[PDB]
């Protein structure tokens, strides 16, 4: 009695029913052990830089600085203009702009033609 | 499973230290800190005086200012100001 | 994703399943007596095939148990008002001012509280005196170049305090 | 909320609601006794014990801890640690 | 599907109203003229009501 | 106006069912009441909507304040599971809750009678959308049933709440505030709703099963 | 009611469409039956600042009710019988509107089936 | 106006021959006295402008911006220590004298009668800011920021000179009255279109609009607080001032040729308010906020309604105050923790209990709080643009929603919820920073009481 | 700092829902409940709590008499 | 002394809070009774809603056919 739990990009696949967790290779055991080793070494270095009574300033997290310089300044290299990048650039940059420009031309031509005929509700339209 | 005895001993040293700190966190010299009608009168008389001074002179010398939706008058009344009647309504029947 | 080990256990996974299903049955089943009936029914359903000597049949029943649990969970489970997602969940995080501060006061406010600041001075001397040789020798003596665990050893050599104790002892009271 | 709590109260209440449980006995029940080792109840019922203390005192304790309590002295110690029971 | 069903039944309502079996509200003075937009002497419109 | 009001009324009425926190039940309840007020603006009756604002305001301020009294008295567990036995655990707040969750529905001459039932009478006697009427009717039945379920799980059942209890109302400010608002929600609905100049035409000429239908739906 | 079921399930003719009510003209079977007294004295109806869509038949009772309710204020429950009389006069108005409805209905049904079955 | 020019000169050798640890007090005191004397200007009445020579004259557009400049000088001259208080006496005096000279050219620029003189003092304002941000930028791309600043602002601003010389020798002199009282319509040829595109595109570069706006954020995140606040407030609102003055000529062709700039400004206002919702680098959020609000200003200038010009000058002055203050709070948090990031410096409700009030009040003046001047400006721009077209109010309100969203996210990100408990260096708030916050906020609220000052020519 | 802690064994399995459910589960064939941790919930000032119509009809124990006095006045 | 917590038992009640609770519930019921019978009876229509208008042919204006 189960609808098999299809996932999505927003409904994440939970840690219970993977079901790849229940047929296990030994290399995955080695991987989990070495991943625990990495987190243990990082917490050891952090806690030794964390409890010094002589230390005053911030701890200078290198991953945060690395992510920030990855996100701000290191986008422009690397870059090459591809067909995908040029297509998506001219789509998201010019397309909606020329769309709203067409609709403003349409609305303004209708409004000026209509007041050239004069059949608007400007019986009193003072604060223009 | 259960505890490894290293965790037991380390946990006991933190029990002694945490209890001594938390017992220290009480302050008790038994001198802990040390330095180194009128309401209704004022608040129903002074803003009432200030506002009612404000509303007579400034407010009613500005002409188009406080204005009241007029009292409704009824056909049995008499006008208090000049003094003249208002004619009553006619016969009632077929109810 | 746990500090002491890498994988939980098989038994630990079955045990977490049992606690989660029993908690969701609490939340599903009010009046507490029909709850007690259904909880003993669940305990019997675990007892009926607890003593199977295989291992791949054990993980088979575990996997189908997660399927037939995730079918029948409850949408808003009764989580306690200290758990994550709960009603409070650091309600009083407004008032957990940490104790690396309180040294940046004006000395008149320090003259209002003599005894607590004197005893904080002796605790801070106890921190500074017993930091370098003992704690750093025990942290750079027993581990290998890879630590491979996160349990840290007690201080059992001769004397003083365990290593790395300050921001674990001097944490706020959690109901200030 | 104004409750007072002490080590005496948590010790007596935990030993009380372990004394009330069915398939152990109040005859041989010290403060210092294991669960699997000498009382001889299974780990399934040990998690039912942990569920009873959670449902009584009103706060979850995690399964990263619930592997390894196993004795009422460390139960009293751990919940006294979580509630910070001193003045 | 549920939002489409609610808006579909609102459209079915908007084409098929209910009403109690009742004529108009009969106003005394020329469908309450001179207390509409005005025209005080332009259009006295002859309309009367009859007792039934 | 009245299509949106009927949509809100049925949607938060059905959504109020199977909710297991107190405050979220009360929020869905007040959303259903604002749905009736949008129906009250859809039919040309604004003054009845204003009367409903006033009575509704007294009423759910009293209800929130009573629930806050209970939640602080019971160590903030705050949820409808693990809530049960509170009648005779001093019954001042249970009197407050039964007066309240009585007054939420149409109780024939209390504060919640006047506003809500003149709303449904003037809504039924009008050239309406013919489905919004049914939505307000079904959602009046729904507010009856979650009012009954909040009473039953909050006050009546077997007591399910952990020991070392310090349930306390020997307290001046709490009983003064609850006292002042129960005196409010018993009399001030009538006192407000009677001495006002009639700014509309009251309908007052209904058939059978159109005036009775409020009490009929709340009883069923 | 039942009129709604008949109008949405039966034929299209014999149940009259509301808000286009006068279909047959008046004095069709009246002759010389009209009073329409309207004793409300429109200028004094303007003088008492009534709301629009109240300046109607049975408004003199509204004038009397407003007069007694203003003139005896601190009695919270002063005017009962005149407010009852105003409700009674609006009940007479509602009865008259229902009489107009079923007059046009019975005329439409009987006369149009007469005409379109003997034409 | 010479009574405002010459004590700005005389305040410069003050800084040189005042002794050590006494330059500060003398410069702050005397620039505040200049601020009072500046506030004595506000005489402007009714029919005409006021003429402080054939060389100087003041429109009522120029009066609140001039008082804003001579009010933002002492605030800045106090704002710019603790990151150069350890530096040398000579370099310190050079920095302070550079700010005084920049004030001098800003007063030159705001009381510019002639448009030629306006252009010369425009790029004279441009000169010292490069020296300031390059010598005290305190980061590694300050060279890139100052260089983009220079070549963008010149290469946009430069054929404006050629168009102004052409107007100079085709219609006589360039006093604003004789440029006015004589201005004839210029029909839809192509040379008139290029003259319009030269002038308006130079100021488009200066505001900036969306296609030319990466000019700005490097010049704010890679600059000291003095150059940042003067750059943002006085230089962008000076560009708007200049467009307001020069748009009196070229009356008929703006209807023909002014549609795509409205378009790029609106869609880039939306995209810029969207890009400043997800970034790190706390300083940059206020920079893209400034880009969004000055795109709104540009829409307001290019439509030509008196409601639009009143809302434009109100939005200019209110956003200048708000963005300068919010830059200053960002520098205060950066002096607390040497981060520049946003997800690091968390907490700060528990610690620093008074700073929450200034963060909240500055974020609400950025939120368009309704009695404030910011909402007065935005509201009249929305009224005028809905008179322009019945459909463009969707973009205005969507800007409003996203503006409230990112501003209040900027509030509840840095200063809401949990200290990271590894910081342990932040000191309680000084009296200097809170004095600066009180010097920012209190003129804005006192103008919110009486905004008949800051509404411009068409009052 | 006494609490006096009312002891165990002063209830049995006599709370009648617990008694009926132990009878049903003993007929099921398990006989292993949690048992005696809920009898304090099922005895004392509890245990015959009032039903639903009684709680709303709780008003006129004092009410009909005062109503008859006010009508007769 | 004021209240104290008690363990695994029904709590104690002062007579004051329970007598105000009984008084206020009894006055609510007294109000709904004295507002039911004496003065309004608004649950009934209060005017006889008639039949289809009169059920009288040749009256209100119809011709015989
Ligand atoms: C901009 C550039 C920077 C400027 C730096 C200095 C700004 C100083 C602004 C002060 C504004 C004060 C406005 C004010 O108080 O108006 C009186 C305000 C508003 O009054 P008002 O200005 O509308 O008119 C009052 C006129 N009389 C005095 C003749 C009646 O008064 C109050 O708020 C009453 C208290
Ligand atoms: C961008 C360059 C702007 C150059 C200055 C504006 C200008 O007059 O351009 C028109 C100039 C040429 O126009 P012009 O200025 O020679 O105009 C001649 C005008 N009539 C015909 C009336 C005598 O074109 C360019 O600068 C091309 C680029």
UniProtKB/Swiss-Prot annotation, chain F:
TM ranges: 1-16, 25-44, 49-71, 90-110, 137-157, 181-201
Family: Belongs to the complex I subunit 5 family.
Subcellular location: Mitochondrion inner membrane
Domain of life: Eukaryota
Entry protein name: NADH-ubiquinone oxidoreductase chain 5
Subunit structure and binding partners: Core subunit of respiratory chain NADH dehydrogenase (Complex I) which is composed of 45 different subunits.
Function: Core subunit of the mitochondrial membrane respiratory chain NADH dehydrogenase (Complex I) which catalyzes electron transfer from NADH through the respiratory chain, using ubiquinone as an electron acceptor. Essential for the catalytic activity and assembly of complex I.
Curated annotation (Swiss-Prot), chain H:
Catalytic reaction(s) noted: a ubiquinone + NADH + 5 H(+)(in) = a ubiquinol + NAD(+) + 4 H(+)(out)
InterPro entries per the UniProt record, alphabetical: NADH4_N, NADH_Q_OxRdtase_chainM/4, NADH_UbQ_OxRdtase, ND/Mrp_TM
EC main group: translocase
The keyword Chaperone belongs to this UniProt entry's keyword annotation: no
E.C. number(s) listed in UniProt: 7.1.1.2
Subcellular location(s) per record: Mitochondrion inner membrane
Stretches that traverse the bilayer: 22-42, 60-80, 98-118, 147-167, 196-216, 224-244, 256-276, 284-303, 308-330, 351-371, 391-411
Keyword annotations from UniProtKB, A to Z: Electron transport, Membrane, Mitochondrion, Mitochondrion inner membrane, NAD, Respiratory chain, Translocase, Transmembrane, Transmembrane helix, Transport, Ubiquinone
Name used for this protein in its record: NADH-ubiquinone oxidoreductase chain 4
Organism: Ovis aries (Sheep)
Lineage of origin: Eukaryota, Metazoa, Chordata, Craniata, Vertebrata
Gene assigned in the entry: MT-ND4
